[PDB]
């Protein structure tokens, strides 16, 4: 209506915040950034509801101002900066380096990553075009645009970005039997190998993907992110490791593991 909408109501807020239904009218609208509103995570939600390093919004703001937070090398001061999938949040006091990675259920898991790994960022490939002055450039689904990529870096590949410099360390070619991580819908957060690629002219390229448990599932190509070669992922994944157990199994795990 009449131009860009500026608020986000707390029910309309995306579920993988894991916000309270109650406790205020609104939720933080993640501002214009390198990630899509619903597939993002603002710095309020991270430092208040997940980590609980700030008891409230004001506290979070204060922390931001203090400038111990750094989402992907640069500093940030905006409460509602959309830090999305693969973004590396480093709090310099604590030295609690994090990478924003999904849990098997779907929500963003707080992955307490080491200092040596929290340095690069793995990122997908959205486009490969040439800009002005005839220079080829790659675009990432995770924000950045990098000039001059190795000619054999094509669409839907993944790219290890040095992050500090904002360059290209290395890449993985998207292909059959190469470790992949899922970022869309019912399979969001799982991890698998890649078996097929149903081509389909226009209407969404599907991908048959099996996990470590030999459990198959299918997703669209845009909802899949190439994380390594089977056995060696390029990033440390959280406990569970994109398996996603059955409900019964989960229950069993819960009520077997009673260690007071």
């Amino acid at each position: 209506a009449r131009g860009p909408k500026k608020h986000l109501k707390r029910l309309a807020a995306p579920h993988h915040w894991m916000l309270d239904k109650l406790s205020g009218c609104y939720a933080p609208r993640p501002s214009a950034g390198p990630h899509k509103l619903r597939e993002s995570l603002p710095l309020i939600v991270f430092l208040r509801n997940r980590l609980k390093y700030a008891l409230n919004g004001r506290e979070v703001k204060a922390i931001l101002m203090q400038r111990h937070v750094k989402v992907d090398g640069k500093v940030r001061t905006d409460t509602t900066f959309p830090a999305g999938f693969m973004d590396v949040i480093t709090l310099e006091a604590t030295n609690e380096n994090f990478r924003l990675v999904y849990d098997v259920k779907g929500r963003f898991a707080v992955h307490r990553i080491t200092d040596e790994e929290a340095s690069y960022k793995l990122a997908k490939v959205k486009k490969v075009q040439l800009g002005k002055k005839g220079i080829p450039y790659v675009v990432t689904h995770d924000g950045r645009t990098i000039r001059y990529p190795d000619p054999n870096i094509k669409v839907n590949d993944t790219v290890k970005v040095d992050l500090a410099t904002g360059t290209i360390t290395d890449f993985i070619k998207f292909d059959t039997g190469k470790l992949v991580y899922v970022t869309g819908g019912r399979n969001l957060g799982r991890v698998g190998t890649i078996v097929h690629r149903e081509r389909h002219e226009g209407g969404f390229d599907l991908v048959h993907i099996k996990d470590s448990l030999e459990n198959t599932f299918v997703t669209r190509l845009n909802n899949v992110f190439v994380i390594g070669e089977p056995g060696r992922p390029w990033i440390s994944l959280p406990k569970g490791k994109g398996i996603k157990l059955t409900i019964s199994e989960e229950r069993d795990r819960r009520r077997a593991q009673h260690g007071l």
Binding site: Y53, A54, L55, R58, Q66, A93
Partner: protein, 134 residues
């Protein structure tokens, strides 16, 4: 008799805010209510913090005396506590002073009045004075 059995559950050390934040859990056996100052003192004794940089809020006792479950922080310094903690908390503690101000409605009215006038008010005053004869 009672001994004010204090605990400090869920201790999160906060280098960002420069504090140790935690759930205060506390017991009364036969006493009823703990009191805030007392709690603060206890915390100080425990943590070597001093009341000045201890800061507590929340609580609401369980039901049938016995227990109380509030929220307490212990800043890395007094200065730090002062420059982070909200003002209300400070006031409650005694550290800071109560900020003497006008009513909200009154303030709003004043603002409106200001908006209605233009430039400096001195000129307006002068004009009024001049009119006084007319």
């Amino acid at each position: 008799s009672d001994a004010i059995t204090i605990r400090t559950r869920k201790v999160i050390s906060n280098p960002l805010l420069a504090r140790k934040q935690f759930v205060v859990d506390v017991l009364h056996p036969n006493r009823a209510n703990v009191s805030k100052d007392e709690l603060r003192e206890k915390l100080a004794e425990a943590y070597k913090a001093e009341k000045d940089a201890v800061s507590v809020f929340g609580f609401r006792t369980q039901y049938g005396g016995g227990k109380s479950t509030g929220f307490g922080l212990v800043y890395n310094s007094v200065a730090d506590a002062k420059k982070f903690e909200p003002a209300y908390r400070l006031v409650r503690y005694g550290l800071a002073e109560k900020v003497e101000k006008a009513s909200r409605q009154q303030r709003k009215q004043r603002k409106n009045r200001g908006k209605k006038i233009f430039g400096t008010g001195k000129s307006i005053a002068k004009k009024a004075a001049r009119r006084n004869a007319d």
